[PDB]
Amino acid sequence: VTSNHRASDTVVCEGRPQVLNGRFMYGPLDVVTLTGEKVDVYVMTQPLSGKWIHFGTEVTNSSGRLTFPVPSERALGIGVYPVRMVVRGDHTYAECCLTVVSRGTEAVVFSIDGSFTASVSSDPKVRAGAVDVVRHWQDSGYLIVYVTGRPDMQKHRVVAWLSQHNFPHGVVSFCDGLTHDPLRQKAMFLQSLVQEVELNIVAGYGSPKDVAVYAALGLSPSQTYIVGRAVRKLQAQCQFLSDGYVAHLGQLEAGSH
Ligand SMILES: [Ca+2]
Numbered sequence: 001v002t003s004n005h006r007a008s009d010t011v012v013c014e015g016r017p018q019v020l021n022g023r024f025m026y027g028p029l030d031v032v033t034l035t036g037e038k039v040d041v042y043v044m045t046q047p048l049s050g051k052w053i054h055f056g057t058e059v060t061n062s063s064g065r066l067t068f069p070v071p072s073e074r075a076l077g078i079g080v081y082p083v084r085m086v087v088r089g090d091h092t093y094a095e096c097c098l099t100v101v102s103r104g105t106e107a108v109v110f111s112i113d114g115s116f117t118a119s120v121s122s123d124p125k126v127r128a129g130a131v132d133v134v135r136h137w138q139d140s141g142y143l144i145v146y147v148t149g150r151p152d153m154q155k156h157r158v159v160a161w162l163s164q165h166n167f168p169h170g171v172v173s174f175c176d177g178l179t180h181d182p183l184r185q186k187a188m189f190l191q192s193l194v195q196e197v198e199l200n201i202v203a204g205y206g207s208p209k210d211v212a213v214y215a216a217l218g219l220s221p222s223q224t225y226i227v228g229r230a231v232r233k234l235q236a237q238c239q240f241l242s243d244g245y246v247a248h249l250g251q252l253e254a255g256s257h
Contacts, residue, residue: 004030005094006155007085009171011143012100013198014078018070022085022094023152025064030153033064037089041068043098044082052084076100080169099143099171107143107199109190109214110134112158113150114207115227116167126165127227129245134168136252143199144170147186151177183209187216194218203257211238223257 007022020041026032037060042052058068066085070076078100086093110116117124138144146167150158152174159172175185193199194217204214205225211234214224224238225248231240241248 001026002028003087003090003092004028004153004156005034005085005087005092006152006174007083007094007096008152009096009173010083010098011145011171011193011197011199012098013103013105013196014100015075016196018075018098018100020068020070020083020085020096020098022066022068022096023064024060024066024087024094025153033062034060034087035062035064036060037087039066040086040088042084042086043070043076044084045076047079047081057088078102097169097171101143101197101199103198104200105143105198106141107145107193107201108137108203109145109147109201109205110170111186111204111206111210111213112146112148112162114210115205116165123161123164127245129249131165131167133245133249133252134170136249137203138168138170142202144168145190145193145199145201146170146172147189148173149175149182149186151175153177183213187213190217208234214238 004025010020012018024034038057039060040057041055043055045053055070055074058066060066076098081098083098084093084095116126116130118127119125134144148158155174173189175182179185194201203223204219207227208231211224211226221237222239225241226238227241229242
C-alpha cells in the first residue's frame, strides 16, 4: 500500500547531458510495480528557495523505471539541486539531488556498510569517529561519494540511517537489485564516475571485500582504507584502520594522505 519510490542521486560534469533516473513501487518488498504512469519531474533550481520548477514528464516502463533527460535549455550550472519526482496519479514522490561539477572534481568514496557499520541487524551501530572522518574530507574540499551493495529498494532506510547519525550530504548510489554481483556493479559505477563524469577519486574506504573494488578502479594501496585489523592476504594491497577512525583522523590532519 505505502509508496516506495526512489530517485538516483545524479552527479554530472558541466556541459554534459543531465539524466535523472527513478523507480516507482509500492509495498515493503516493492511487491507492486508502478507500470506505465506519468511522473512529473521537479528541480529546485534555486537550492535554498524552496520553490519547485516543473522540468517535464515521463512514463514508467514495465519495471516501474523512469529515465528523464533534462532539456538543454534548462541544464543546471555547477551546484547541488534538490529533485523531486511526483506520481501524477496519487501525488506520491521520490527525492534526490542533482550535483553538477567542474571537470576533474576530486572525490572520496565510502562503502557504507563496510565503512560505517560496527554491528549487524535493529539499527546497526555506527563506528566511532566515522562521521568525523567523512566530515573531514568534505570540509577539505572533496566530493563525498557513498556506495553500497544494497538494492535501492532499501534506499529509504539507508538514507534515514545516514541522516540519523548526521553524516555529511553526499552522492548516494545503490545497486539496481537485479545484477546479483554487487562488487562488480560498484566497481563499474565508480569507473563510470571517473570516465563519464571525470571525477578524480583520491581515496577509498570500506571493508576487506572492497579492496577488489578499489583495486579495479586503479586506486593505490596507500589510497585504500580498510576497517579492522591487518589481514595477511591483503598485506600490501591497502591501509588498515587498525587503531580506529579517531586515530586515523589525527593522522589525516597531520597530513598523512
Ligand atoms: Ca546500513
